[PDB]
Symmetry: C2
Subunit: 624 residues, 2 copies
């Protein structure tokens, strides 16, 4: 096993455990100290204003199992500190018959048991568990724990009658899944249900959704309401909030609803951020965010989606969320988005970026798997003065349109996503910033033009505004993690409305994924404009490439170039001519970003372990 | 619910939880503070000379489940103190995927991990578990824990490869069971295997048996040897030590070998107690003690048995224990005998006495189930100068015979059992002792003659020597827990060789068992004697009646008379005449015995709880 990054890679499968720990590892984002991580969980803003982030964790292993909550905190979403207790960075782990198979996703009641922050989480026990298996009642239940020390530790309620687990009966038969309880307050739903509380007797100020589906009949999001304010044991099933068909698709802009939902949440947003009104704010929009499974041929069969919904009250005192329009939260190798409230009327979302090593060929040599996305502010994105000649505008697929009185302009409404400003300020302030001269890409443009300033390592951000003719057939974008022999190409092709990441040359290491990523991006043409603009921001962080377009479209992916000098970046141009010119302006390189984990040394591996022969006997976990 | 014990009992099923807690409860023996208990476990003499006793425990429930080790200690086997820690009187509980279904029986390595006392115990996980079910590998494994505080707490080894569980592979296919590891040192087995250690590479100074059987093909006791001295992870399977047939019986004196063994142990005894020789002591005998299941129509389908064995070395470096003769450790409602070494060359045995409420009609009103037997010294019982005209003497069923050179007398050898002298001394010293005049039972004897001194409560011992003609057809014994309308009759009938406990009138409460108990007792006639003698000792302790005959035969049973004055005792006589006279001498009543738990108040109930609806979903425990 040679680690010489100035020559072709050898047979890296001969390398020892965690020998590639630093080679591809993100440094500027949320990631576990070592081992396996997946979904964010237990997200809340603590009383001191700091952010508590949990995550599905399996230390000293590179596959899922014994799943636990790992945790850390931050004052700015950007620089983090691990908790350190009797179980290291874990704060909740399998310990009782009701959760011994895994502490799955959960969400926070800020003022819960005895007034303490409280998690409602999926407690799993024995039996087949999965949307394609024959799951039985009891395998997935919902349980409570509370913290008296601001997340350093959690105390579970006792096992038994009138204690844990608090939710165990399936609300409908033949569920595909029953997990990921999402607790939220909703002046909106309280106002809609206020005339019907005699039917259900549920009058609490918290709601919870549970994610699942019905065998052969599509995904379901189940709505519960806290039975009584200030009491956390009794949750009353109201009815299905979101009902979708078996592998139903709302179309090209909307992924696929698959067979089962995971990690679903409910929020209400306005153009500024989070909306706390009861329905009185005409600028506010109800949103559901949710993962779907088995509706996709790749990306681990997983879509992270969102929908704008209009609530209807049923005669039985329940809510139907009717989908108005439906989009994609991230088009790449990410999933399990969680959103939570933050002071200043913010709703902040974060997800999990998995690796692109689906055959588990170098996972042991890494000694870890997984990272978070960046933390994103959600808001209602409003585009004014949109031209009705914008191609495809009235399909209203993942956006709404509202005509002016005179029918000569349109207001477009969609879900907005942008990186939290604390992270952008910290990244820029800690970086070497190069402001680049604007570039016209014409007949003289090479396929690839390196920027006048170059990154020094695999930790940088790029931004630019690409101005295209209304009838362009030109393509442009950014090349990143680039040497002569390895590079990753990010293209936008306005004629197809496709943003692509081409990874055929991303790495000399052939075991990593090399498939092309694709997002749809609608350039809303403005009345009187003779051009259309893509604002593209790219974060490069070890192996993570995280792309944002127009504060709307996000695409997370992975690239693992071997060579030490595969760090370069610049402009891509295809079919640019004297007549079909792409104007590039607002160009900036941020080299370095931030050390997100300042207390951690470069190598936080503790080694890997095998569960031994009993892993295959129990049949619950891979064992490594 | 009336608790008036001066009138007939009402409908006691209407009484609240633990309202009958003190009514029938033993006071002079080992019993949990409350709730469910079964098998003794983790027995050892600590470094300070005190006795540590564990037991299968389910606090705040009256059925088995979440099975844990409860624990206490004593300097004299008689007066006990509970441990008190973070889990009350528990010291080991289900906590890991490998033991979450129950911490089953285990036994002690006195000098184990890091030199500390160490338990090897059956760690259970999910799946069908039972001799009549289709159990799979992994459901029952064997795991280690050690104590750094003399049994106040136990630290389990970690889960995984080269750690817990340490024994998990089935040594043969289609096991009926795989549990109750019994760790022991054996100079005898070390000497027998010393020429074969090249075949197996196992050279440690500890052996372990595991109890089980093979579907359709009878019980098995599996022998393991510690692979290396001072190392406790690796245990090498040698082979089956005891192999018996499917519901095989050695006859009337020997119960039935059933389909599966439980709680088996291995020892070596001589006439004084425990024998530590390598085979050089010609007076020493190898014994196996073991429970069997599904070979009995009643007593919960359970026989507590013992066998004298002759060891043979197999060519593959394993031991065959060939049964020489085979007996019964207790003929009544007891099971799960454990034996352990005690200073002074002693081997001490203790078991579990279950209730006689098999339909669980008043278990909640009790608020507890179960007690121990008394602690018994085991030894080789030798009877010299036995007459060859002793009926049935040369069947050698549960004893051996050795002729004198001249063939005119016989030495009889069997397993001896007697109550530990510390308990007899403490009971007698704390009691009001009445020494009773000898009585000849003849033509003038009533059916029942009360003793001249009477007990004052349900806590007393009786002793007597019953001298019968060699050709008697008379019956005699003791009546206990007796008023005019409730009583328990203990009869010996030399003509049938049957000791019976008749319980048709034991209680006015009709839901308790009322079936007749039976033991076989051989009166070894002595050369030159014109009579044969039964020495009978009876302990009455709440509802426990524990009978010992001739330091050989034990019979534990239960009686639950309702009336406050059902406490009397005396002599029984049937078919005694001027010619067929039973001489009764050495008569003594010990009234009061000892308060075995001086720190405990009279009512140690903490209430009962229900596990709720998930108990039936998981399907492992009754839930109450
Ligand atoms: C199979 O058997 C299993 C084992 O028995 C069983 O699991 C056990 O279940 C029981 C019952 O549910 C659990 O007991 C609960 O424990 C809760 C506390 O749990 C936390 O703390 C304990 C103990 O911590 C001490 O000891 C440990 C270990 O040594 C130390 O590490 C700690 O530092 C601490 O040490 C101090 O104290 C020791 C003695 O206790 C001293 O010896 C020592 O020197 C120290 O000073 C930990 O063990 C727990 O860890 C375990 O669990 C966590 C998850 O929670 C895991 O992460 C971890 O790995 C472990 O597995 C944990 O950290 C108690 O809060 C709880 O008691 C409350 O509930 C019951 C109701 O059910 C009440 O009776 C009781 O009164 C308490 O309720 C009151 O208090 C709360 C708030 O304080 C109120 O909300 C409530 O209304 C009520 O208020 C009352 O009091 C108020 C004021 O005082 C008053 O105003 C009110 O009006 C009212 O009166 C309960 O005891 C137990 O933890 C489980 N143990 C384990 C090991 O899992 C399992 O379920 C069984 N399974 C089945 C299938 O049956
Ligand atoms: C799913 O996830 C689960 C959770 O992660 C996981 O379970 C956890 O498994 C891990 C790994 O097996 C277990 O970790 C082991 O812990 C052993 C100690 O366990 C006892 O103590 C802990 C910690 O106790 C502290 O904290 C609690 C809770 O707060 C307090 O109550 C205590 O009072 C105590 O508090 C003090 O310390 C705290 C910080 O630690 C302070 O914060 C505090 O202020 C206090 O001062 C308890 O939590 C344990 O309780 C749990 O388990 C018991 C049963 O054991 C239950 O009854 C209970 O309910 C709980 O469930 C328990 O009481 C460690 O001994 C062990 O470390 C040794 O082993 C590893 C090898 O694997 C070595 O790396 C390590 O070095 C240690 O080995 C050395 O030491 C021993 C002897 O000391 C030697 O035999 C050995 O050779 C070696 O020697 C070395 O050192 C020598 C000298 O120093 C030197 O001479 C030698 O040469 C050599 O170097 C290991 O850490 C963990 O306990 C489990 N946790 C739980 C909650 O279950 C589960 O398995 C997962 N499941 C799956 C399917 O994967
Ligand atoms: C005395 O000790 C018992 C523990 O043994 C304490 O708890 C009770 O235990 C018994 C079992 O011994 C439970 O009986 C079972 O009850 C269920 C149906 O239960 C539902 O209806 C009840 C009646 O009003 C109600 O109390 C229950 O409420 C509790 O549980 C829910 C969770 O479901 C929880 O949310 C609440 O907060 C409560 O804690 C519940 O809603 C029944 O299905 C069982 O039937 C089986 O067994 C019976 C009898 O053999 C048989 O007839 C059936 O056919 C079936 O086979 C069983 O009756 C009882 O529910 C428990 N009560 C509780 C927990 O409050 C009891 O509390 C102790 N008493 C005191 C005063 O401390
Ligand atoms: C690096 O990190 C790994 C953890 O990932 C550490 O542990 C090793 O993990 C791997 C899995 O990643 C284990 O591989 C499996 O091994 C078994 C067969 O194992 C037996 O033979 C081994 C070879 O000599 C031997 O080491 C093992 O000994 C350990 O375990 C026993 C318990 O059985 C224990 O008693 C010992 O004390 C040791 O701890 C064991 O006897 C094999 O069956 C598995 O095969 C599956 O997968 C492979 C590969 O995909 C496939 O080919 C098969 O067809 C099948 O599907 C698998 O190979 C390995 O045994 C673990 N080694 C251990 C525990 O020592 C590893 O230690 C870390 N290295 C360092 C230097 O820290
Ligand atoms: C691309 O980014 C530019 C620079 O941020 C955006 O221009 C701003 O847009 C807002 C909202 O209309 C204005 O109020 C600002 O004053 C504009 N600043 C400029 C032109 O520098 C532009 O709108 C973005 N374009 C798209 C299509 O998202
Ligand atoms: C019944 O008990 C008596 C009294 O303990 C036993 O008699 C003793 O037996 C031992 C062993 O042979 C003698 O060494 C004692 O000296 C005897 N004491 C006496 C006669 O008082 C008697 O053996 C017991 N009988 C049976 C059949 O077990
Ligand atoms: C980078 O490294 C490779 C391999 O060492 C080398 O061949 C190449 O010339 C270097 N520079 C660039 C920009 O590719
Ligand atoms: C890489 O080494 C592995 C062992 O990890 C071997 O099985 C595989 O064939 C090797 N690939 C080569 C030589 O191309
Ligand atoms: C990281 O540390 C681990 C654990 O000590 C070690 O096995 C590994 O080789 C180290 N890797 C690197 C790149 O230093
Ligand atoms: C309420 O009605 C809806 C729609 O019919 C149904 O799906 C749901 O189960 C009902 N709620 C109940 C029965 O609580
Ligand atoms: C919205 O405006 C477009 C362009 O003027 C027009 O074709 C369409 O009919 C309008 N829709 C409504 C509801 O007026
Ligand atoms: C660098 O990053 C840290 C950590 O996020 C941040 O607090 C600090 O303000 C940044 N420095 C700048 C912008 O000068
Ligand atoms: C004992 O109590 C019962 C019921 O109170 C009574 O009838 C009887 O006379 C009393 N005495 C005896 C020795 O039975
Ligand atoms: C005793 O009361 C129970 C309720 O615990 C009742 O079901 C049973 O029939 C009663 N027995 C009677 C009245 O004989
Ligand atoms: C024993 O104490 C328990 C628990 O406090 C109580 O429920 C029960 O009624 C008491 N029983 C008696 C006989 O005092
Ligand atoms: C040794 O031989 C016995 C008797 O044939 C057999 O039952 C046992 O499995 C053997 N031991 C092994 C294979 O370790
Ligand atoms: C033992 O003694 C009895 C009675 O004398 C006799 O019948 C029998 O044959 C003897 N057994 C042996 C082995 O001598
Ligand atoms: C009474 O019993 C205690 C506890 O077993 C014992 O230590 C004490 O010696 C006994 N008293 C006597 C025999 O006087
Ligand atoms: O780790 C388990 C968790 O991961 C998810 O499957 C999302 O990928 C959640 O539905 C579940 O709670
Ligand atoms: O509580 C479980 C324990 O009880 C027994 O079944 C004996 O009755 C043992 O075989 C087992 O270890
Ligand atoms: O929080 C931390 C985690 C790991 C480490 O090694 C240092 C700090
Ligand atoms: O050890 C003890 C158990 C219970 C109780 O109440 C008092 C002492």
């Amino acid at each position: 096993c040679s680690l010489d990054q100035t020559v072709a890679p050898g047979n890296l499968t001969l390398c020892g455990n965690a020998t590639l720990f630093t080679t591809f590892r993100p440094k500027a984002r949320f990631i576990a100290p070592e081992g396996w991580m997946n979904a964010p969980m237990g997200l809340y803003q603590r009383a001191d204003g700091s952010i508590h982030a949990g995550y599905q964790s399996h230390p000293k292993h590179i596959q899922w199992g014994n799943i636990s909550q790992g945790a850390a905190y931050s004052s700015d979403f950007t620089s983090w500190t691990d908790f350190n207790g009797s179980e290291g960075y874990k704060t909740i782990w399998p310990s009782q018959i009701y959760d011994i198979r895994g502490v799955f996703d959960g969400s926070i009641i800020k003022e819960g048991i005895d007034g303490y922050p409280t998690i409602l989480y999926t407690s799993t026990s024995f039996g087949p568990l999965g949307a394609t298996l024959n799951e039985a009642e009891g395998t997935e239940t919902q349980s409570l724990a509370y913290t008296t020390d601001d997340g350093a530790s959690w105390i579970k309620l006792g096992y038994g009658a009138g204690q844990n687990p608090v939710i165990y009966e399936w609300p409908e038969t033949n569920l595909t899944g029953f997990r990921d309880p999402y607790v939220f307050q909703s002046p909106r739903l309280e106002a809609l249900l206020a005339n019907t509380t005699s039917i259900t007797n549920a009058t609490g100020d918290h709601f919870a959704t549970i994610s699942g589906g019905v065998h052969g009949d599509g995904a379901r999001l189940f709505l519960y309401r806290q039975h009584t304010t200030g009491e956390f044991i009794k949750w009353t099933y109201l009815g299905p909030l979101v009902t979708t068909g078996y592998k139903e698709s709302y179309g090209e802009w909307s992924g696929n609803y698959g067979i089962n939902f995971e990690t679903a949440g409910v929020t209400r947003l306005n153009p500024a951020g989070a909306a706390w009104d009861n329905g009185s704010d005409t600028t506010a929009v109800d949103f559901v965010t949710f993962g779907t499974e088995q509706g996709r041929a790749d990306h681990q069969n997983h879509w992270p989606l969102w929908a704008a919904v209009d609530y209807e009250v049923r005669d039985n005192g329940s809510i139907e969320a009717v989908i108005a329009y439906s989009g994609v939260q991230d088009w790449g190798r990410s999933y399990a988005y969680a959103s939570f409230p933050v002071e200043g009327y913010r709703q902040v979302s974060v997800g999990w970026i998995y690796e692109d090593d689906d055959n588990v060929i170098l996972a042991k040599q890494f000694g870890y798997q997984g990272a978070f996305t960046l933390f994103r502010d959600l808001f209602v994105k409003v585009v004014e003065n949109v031209s009705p000649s914008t191609p495809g505008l009235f399909e209203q697929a993942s956006w709404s349109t509202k005509n002016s009185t005179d029918g000569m302009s349109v207001t477009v409404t969609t879900l907005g996503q942008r990186v939290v400003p604390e992270t952008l300020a910290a990244y820029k302030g800690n970086s070497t910033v190069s402001t680049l001269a604007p570039v016209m890409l014409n007949e003289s443009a090479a396929a690839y033009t390196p920027f006048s300033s170059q990154p020094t390592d695999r930790f940088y951000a790029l931004t630019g505004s690409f101005e295209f003719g209304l009838n362009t057939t030109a393509k442009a974008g950014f090349r990143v993690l680039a040497s002569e022999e390895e590079y990753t190409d990010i293209w936008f092709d306005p004629a197809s409305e496709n943003l692509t990441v081409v990874r055929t040359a991303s790495s000399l290491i052939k075991s990593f994924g090399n498939d092309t990523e694709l997002a749809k991006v609608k350039l809303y043409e403005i009345v009187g404009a003779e051009s259309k603009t893509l604002n593209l921001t790219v974060f490069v962080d070890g192996s993570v490439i995280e792309i944002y377009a127009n504060d709307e479209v996000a695409l997370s992916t992975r690239a693992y170039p071997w060579l030490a000098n595969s760090t370069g970046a610049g402009l891509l141009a295809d079919g640019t001519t004297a007549g079909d010119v792409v104007g590039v302006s607002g160009l900036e390189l941020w080299d370095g970003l931030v050390d997100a984990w300042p207390a951690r040394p470069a190598n936080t591996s503790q080694g890997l372990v095998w569960d031994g022969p009993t892993a295959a006997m129990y049949g619950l976990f891979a064992g490594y």
